[PDB]
């Protein structure tokens, strides 16, 4: 193809192509945008408790003076120590782990913390951590660069150790292809 | 009237503070459009 012009020509302007795909491919970071996202949801989430806890003293105000108008106030505090209160939904047995149990009460709501199920990702051998998680401070909460994922099984029969995902590792695969693609004059890319 | 989100202005309610167009700068045909930003009318929802 290079002993031609006509194919030396057109390796020219696919390299030429590939050297502005390259550039192109600099612009972009998953990590960034990933983060941006969390934090407008974690934005969203704030106001939204926010009003929820605003809501929530109006409302407990209104109670208590409905009640002291109705002289039955020892009753409004029983309610209201139920509402804050609730009850603990015990922890739930399964064959793939056992569900953390969490209260109910309008201020476990309010504090909106959660504890993240220990489960398993159906037809693999992922074991979901468990952990909690507040959607207020999510803002709070970065995008990790990397993270290790659990072990995997494939057709349920083959296994694969934990994998460790990279934002930056995948980019930088694909780019470093299309430099290959771009340095194939008289290579071959490797085959990893 | 105990209007809900009570006492909440437009930015409370997650408003933008200024909304921007966007800026196109095609560098080929020598094109260049600015960004104009707008401002939202403001206002405050009444706790009664």
Do not use: C
């Amino acid at each position: 193809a290079l002993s031609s012009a006509s194919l030396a020509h057109m390796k020219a302007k696919f390299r030429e192509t590939l050297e502005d795909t390259r550039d192109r491919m600099y612009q972009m970071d998953i990590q960034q945008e990933l983060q941006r996202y969390l934090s407008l949801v974690g934005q969203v989430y704030s106001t939204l408790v926010t009003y929820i806890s605003d809501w929530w003293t109006l409302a407990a105000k209104n109670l208590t003076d409905f009640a002291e108008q109705y002289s039955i106030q020892d009753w409004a505090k029983r309610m209201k120590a139920l509402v804050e209160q609730g009850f603990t939904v015990p922890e739930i047995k399964t064959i793939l782990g056992t569900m953390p149990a969490f209260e109910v009460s309008l201020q476990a709501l309010q504090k909106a913390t959660f504890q993240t199920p220990d489960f398993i990702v159906p037809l693999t051998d992922l074991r979901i951590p468990s952990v909690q998680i507040n959607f207020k401070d999510l803002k709070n909460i970065k995008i990790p660069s990397r993270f290790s994922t659990p072990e995997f099984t494939i057709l349920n029969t083959f296994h694969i150790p934990s994998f460790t995902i990279d934002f930056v590792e995948m980019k930088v695969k694909i780019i470093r292809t299309i430099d290959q693609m771009l340095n194939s004059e008289l290579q071959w890319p490797v085959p990893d | 009237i105990p209007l809900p989100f009570g006492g909440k202005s437009s930015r409370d309610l997650k408003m933008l503070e200024t909304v921007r167009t966007p800026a196109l700068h095609f560098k080929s045909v020598g094109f260049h459009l600015p960004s104009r930003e707008f401002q939202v009318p403001t206002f405050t929802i009444p706790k009664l």
